[PDB]
Amino acid sequence: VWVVGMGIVMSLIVLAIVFGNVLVITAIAKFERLQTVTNYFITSLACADLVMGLAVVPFGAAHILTKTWTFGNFWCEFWTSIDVLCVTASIETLCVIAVDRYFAITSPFKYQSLLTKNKARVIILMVWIVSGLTSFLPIQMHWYRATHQEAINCYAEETCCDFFTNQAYAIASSIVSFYVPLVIMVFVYSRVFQEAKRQLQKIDKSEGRHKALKTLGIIMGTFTLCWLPFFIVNIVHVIQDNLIRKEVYILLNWIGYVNSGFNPLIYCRSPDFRIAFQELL
Amino acid sequence: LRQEAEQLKNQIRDARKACADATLSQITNNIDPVGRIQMRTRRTLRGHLAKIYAMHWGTDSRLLVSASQDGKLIIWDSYTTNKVHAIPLRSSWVMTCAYAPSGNYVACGGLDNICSIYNLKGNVRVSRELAGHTGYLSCCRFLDDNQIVTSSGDTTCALWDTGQQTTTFTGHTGDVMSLSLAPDTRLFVSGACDASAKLWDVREGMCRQTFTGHESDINAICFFPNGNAFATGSDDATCRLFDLRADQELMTYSHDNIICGITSVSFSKSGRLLLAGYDDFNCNVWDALKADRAGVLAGHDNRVSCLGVTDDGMAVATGSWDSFLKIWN
Amino acid sequence: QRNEEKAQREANKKIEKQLQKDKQVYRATHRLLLLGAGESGKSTIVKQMRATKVQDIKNNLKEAIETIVAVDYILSVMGVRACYERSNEYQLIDDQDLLRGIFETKFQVDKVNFHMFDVGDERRKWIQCFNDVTAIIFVVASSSYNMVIRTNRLQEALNLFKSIWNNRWLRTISVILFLNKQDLLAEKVLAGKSKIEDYFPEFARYTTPEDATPEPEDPRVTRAKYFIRDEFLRISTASGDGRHYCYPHFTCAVDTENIRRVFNDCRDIIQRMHLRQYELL
Amino acid sequence: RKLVEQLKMEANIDRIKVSKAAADLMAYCEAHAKEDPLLTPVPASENPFR
Ligand SMILES: CN[C@@H]1CCc2c(ccc(O)c2O)[C@H]1O
Q: Which listed residue, of A172, B84, B145, C193, carries a Cα 20 to 30 Å from A254's Cα?
C-alpha cells in the first residue's frame, strides 16, 4: 500500500509541474504586451521545466515504482541524457535571469542598449547549446559509462539501468550545471542587495517620514535548498562510495526535481503575470 | 451688460425645451434591438516605435495613415499589412493626422504651433508648413487637396489655404480639441476644452449653433453620415448625440460601470452603431438609436487613442496608446 | 500581381530596417520635461545646462520700463527705486552680463544621450501627453513668496506641483525639483521687509529638522529653505509610495553642477524604477 | 461684448421638432442598414480582410 500512495504523489507532482510550466508558457506567448526582453529567459526556463516534467519525472516515477526499467538500454541512456540536459538548462537559465537582473540594476543606462531581443535570443541559444554540449555528447557517446566492476553488468543488462558515473564526469558535470551558476547568482544577488540597501538608505536620508530581504531570500533559498544537497551528495558518493546509499541519492534527486514546478511560483508573481493568468483562465 | 446675455440664454433654453415634443428613446422603443455583436481582429498592424495619437483612414478603404509620438508618421496598407511610406516628422510630437480625399497629400499636426503638409506623391517632402497659432494643434482635416482645417490649442480654429489663414473662427471659452466634417464641405463642427460644442459654416465663418449639454472636457466629435447630427465624446463617461435641426441632445449614452474617459468617437457606414473608444483599455459599441451597448472590443493592452471607419464601411480601425494598431472587422 | 506584391514587400523591408535603427536610437536617448513657471528662473537652469540678441535685450528693457510705468519723457516715449521697492506686487521681468515655441535641448553627460523638453496654459491638457518621459525637471523660485498674485506665487507653484503629482496619466513619472534663486531667497530672508511667517502662518510653529545642516549660512536662512523644501515635499510624500519621488535640489544661479545632478538623479530614478519592479523594493 | 450679439443672432433661427428629426433619423437608419458590413455579419468572400 506504501507504493500505491507514492504513485499518486508522484503523479500529482508531475501534473503540477506540467500545469505550471504550461500556464507560464501560454501566458508568456499569447499576449504580446507581456512578452518582453527579460521574459524570453522565463520562457526558456518554463520550456525546460515542461520538457523535464513531461520526459524524466514520469519515466523516473515509472522506474522507481516498478523497480524494473522496461525500455531498452539505448532508450534509458537517452532518458538520462534528457534528464541531465533539462537540469543544466534550468539552472543555467536561473543564472542568466540573475545576471540579467544584476545588469539591469547595477548598470541602468547601459542595460537597455546592451540587451535586445536578438541578444536575448542569442544568449538563450548559447545557453541551450552549452547545455547540449555538456549533456548529450558525454552521455550519448559512452564516455560516462562506469569503469567499476559494479554496474558493468547493470549497463549490459537491459532491464536494470541505474546511474553509475565515472569519477571524472560527475564533478565536471556538477561544476558546469550547478556550482558555477551558484557562485555567479550568489555574488550577483549580493551586489543587487547592496544596491537595494543603498537605495533604501538614500530614501530614508532624503525623506524624514526588510522588503528586499524577503524576495532575494526566497529566490535564492528555494533554488539552493532544492539543488545544493543533491549536487553535494553526488560528489560525495564519487569521493566515498560507502557513504551514500541509493535511496538518499534518489530522494535528493527528486527533491531537486520539484524545483521545476516551484520555479513558476517564484518567477511569475508580478501583477502583469497574475492578470494574464486570470484572463487566460 | 451681462443681463441681456443671460436673458438671451434663458430664451434659447426655453425655445429648445419647447421644441422637445418627444424623446428619441420614446420613438425607438418600437424598433428591434441590433443584438449582440462579436467583433474579431482581422489584422494587428504593428511597428510603431512609441505611443500613437491619431490615425485617419484613406479615401479608399485600403490605405491608412498612423501618427505616433515618436515622430514617425507611417502610411499603412490595411489589406496586405505593408508600410508604403515612412515620413519622419520634423516636430518631435504629432497630435493628429489627416488624409486627402484625393490621397495626394498627408497632413500631420504637432505640439508645435506649426502644421506641416507632406506631398506623398518617390521621396516624401514637406509641401508648405503652415503659419501657426498661439498653442498646439488638436485635429486636422482636408476639405480638398488645397484647404486644410486645423483646430488649435487656443480658442481659434482656422481654415488654411499659400500659408494664409482665410478665416479665423472664434467663440470658444476654452481650447478646441477635436473636429469633424459633414459629408458636404459647407458645414463642420468642433469640440472644445469647455463643455461647448459648436457648428461653424465655412463660407460665412460664424458659429451658427452652439451645444453645451456636457459637463466636462470634450475629446472627440464624430459626424452623422446623413449630415444632420453629430456625436460628442466627453471627459466623463457620458457620450451624447445632438441633432442639428432640433439643436439639443436627442439621446445620452452612459452606464454606471463605466467611469473612464472617452478618446475617439466614430460612426458606422449606416450610422446604426456608434463605435466609441474609452480611456479604459476597452472600446465600446453602442446602438445609436436604442442607446444600448451591443458589444465590447478590448483587444488593446493600453488605452485607445483613435478610431476610424472606411468610406465603404468594411472595417473599423482602433489605434491605442500601445504601439499596436488593430483593424477590427 | 506578383510584381506588385514583390514591390510592396521590398518597400516594407526597407522601412522595417530603417525603423529598427530608429527604435534603437530612440531607446538610446531619454526624455525630460521642463515645467518652469513664468518668470521662475527656468531660463537660468537651461543656461546652467549649457546684434539680434542685443535688440532682444533692449526690447526686454523696454518691456520692464513699460511694466514699471503700468520721468515724463520716459512715460511719453513708451522715482525709479519706488518700482523696485514695490516690485513684489506686480509681475516684473529682471555676454556674461546678458546671461545674468517648444524648445528642445540635447546633451550628453557620460556618453548617454539626453533630450530636454520645454513647453509653454491653465488647463495643461498637454501634461498627460508626456507619460513616457524619464523624469520631470520642475524648477521654482524660493523667493517667489514675496511676490503676490491677485495666492502667492510660491503657493501657486505648490498648487501646480500638487496637480501634477496627483495625476492619473503621470502615475509612473518622477519629479526633479530645483529651487532657483537661493541667494535671492537668503537676501530676502535677511531683510525684514517680508516675513515668511507673515505670509505662511505655519512657519511660526515650524522648526528646522535636527539632521539638516547642508551649508556653512545664518540659521534663519537655512530654516527658510527647509520650510520651503518641506512644504514642497509633503504633498509628494502624502500622496503615495512607489514610482513617485521628489528630489529637491537647492541650487544657485552661478553653480554649474546641475548638469551632473540631473544625470545622477535620472540614473537613480531608473535604478529605483527597476528596484520597484521585480518586487525587490 | 459681442457674445450677446452672437447669442441673439443664433437665437433667431427656426427649429425643427424633435419628433420629426427622430423619425427622419430612424428612416435613414432603416433604409441604409442593409448596406452596412458592420451591422450585418461580414460574408467570408465579400470581406477583403477575411
Ligand atoms: C538519475 N540521476 C541524474 C544523473 C546525474 C545528474 C543529474 C542531474 C544533473 C547533473 O548535472 C547530473 O550529472 C541526475 O538527474
A: A172
Resolution at which this structure was determined, Å? 3.8
Dist. CA A164–CA A145, nearest whole Å: 7
Q: Best mutation site among B43, B45, B65, B72 for testing chain C: the one with the most C CBs within 10 Å? A: B72
Which H or E run contains B76? strand B72-77
Chain A residues with beta carbon closer than 8 angstroms to that of C270 = 108-109
Does A177 contact ligand 1 (Cβ within 6 A)?
A: yes
Q: Is residue B227 part of a domain?
A: yes
- Give the number of other Cβ atoms within 10 Å of residue B181's Cβ: 18
Identify which of B138, B134, B128 has the alpha carbon closest to the alpha carbon of residue B98.
B138
Q: Would you call A200 an interface residue with chain C, using a CB distance cutoff of 8 Å? A: yes
Structurally, chain D folds into a number of domains equal to 1
What kind and span of H or E run contains C77?
Answer: helix C72-77
CA A39/CA A35 separation, integer angstroms: 6
Residue B230 neighbours by CB under 8 Å, 6+ apart: B180, B189, B197, B199, B221, B222, B223, B224, B241, B242, B244
Q: Are B257 and B284 in contact (CB under 8 A)?
A: no
Using CA coordinates, name the residue in chain A closest to B321.
A33
Q: What is the full DSSP assignment across B146-215?
A: S-EEEEESSS-EEEE----EEEEE---SS----EEE-SSSSEEEE--SSS-EEEEETTT-SEEEEE---S
Number of domains in chain C: 1
- Give the number of other CB atoms < 10 A from CB of residue C53: 9
Nearest to B99 by CA among B58, B139, B60: B58
DSSP output for B210-240: EE---SS-EEEEEE-TTSSEEEEEESSS-EE
DSSP code for C96: H
CATH number of the structural domain spanning residue B254: 2.130.10.10
- Within-domain flag for B185: yes
Q: Parallel, antiparallel, or unpaired: how do β-strands C174-180 and C135-141 relate?
A: parallel
CATH of the domain at D27: 4.10.260.10
CA distance B64 to B79: 10
What Rg value do the Cα atoms of chain B yield, rounded? 19
